[PDB]
């Protein structure tokens, strides 16, 4: 059960451990729309999918205030912000604006960039297990330093996220 | 036929188009060792998987010269360098050296970090189709701006990469 985690970015770890999810977790399906990541985390953290919007507001509020710590989102949007200016205080400002313009839309697909913001915003550990259709682990990453049993575990299959709860606990 | 690509990183696109690979591509199997990504790309690009080593050399030589454009790999190795140092420019030089120390080993598993390098180094588009074990697409990434029929298409099933050729051409 002891898993070796290697450092992969700020507050971010990966592992090579390969398991079948169903032998340790119960999977809880959430609604298949563009908010599934927010619903899955809201289900584990607040015990209901219906708080996805609070989860989403928490993530975006954290970005507004700690943009320099959203390495996933800023990696994409700060790069793209430099390439509108020629068309370092003020690029990263514009990158945050571009991110917020996308993320505030109703159609936005939450995912791994927002998992990083929630883990820091709430001081929790979020594990994202990427699986195939047979629920076999293709890879796993983890924002935060807690162990898998002390963490909120999410499963990704292609574009869709669901929640996982550990069986024995 | 027409896929809508979402920007996902610098020169990196994603899509949730869902297909069966055998309906559009013939798949060409390459040797199943840690060089299979290089072998898959060498098969499409140079018509032989035995130029995998030139492909690898292309990717790593590109990284030596363009480390700051190697967004996937530099995210990992620049962070590891800056935590080695605690125990903006000295960091990234160390990060590249850490990357090369892993990547130049014969046992290194090439993959998306090097797809990004090859796409920029050679000015081509590489498409990575992640499939489950029955070859149904889970999701797909594209390094570069060309369309699927003008790109080098690679299928990935867990850790293993093979080449894809489009049936129509």
Residue numbers in the entry:
A (entry chain A), B (entry chain B): 2 to 88, 102 to 183
Task: Quote from the publication.
Instead, the vOTU’s primary function appears to be the reversal of post-translational modifications by ubiquitin (Ub) and the Ub-like protein interferon stimulated gene product 15 (ISG15). Each vOTU possesses a seven-stranded beta sheet as the core feature, with five major alpha helices framing the rest of the structure.
This is facilitated by hydrophobic packing between Ile86, Val105, Ala82, and the aliphatic portion of the Arg108 sidechain. Looking at the selectivity pocket of FARV vOTU reveals it to possess more of a hydrophilic character and contains a relatively bulky Gln155 residue in the equivalent site to position 131 in CCHFV. Removing this region reduced activity towards Ub-AMC by almost 60%, suggesting that this motif could play a significant role in Ub binding.
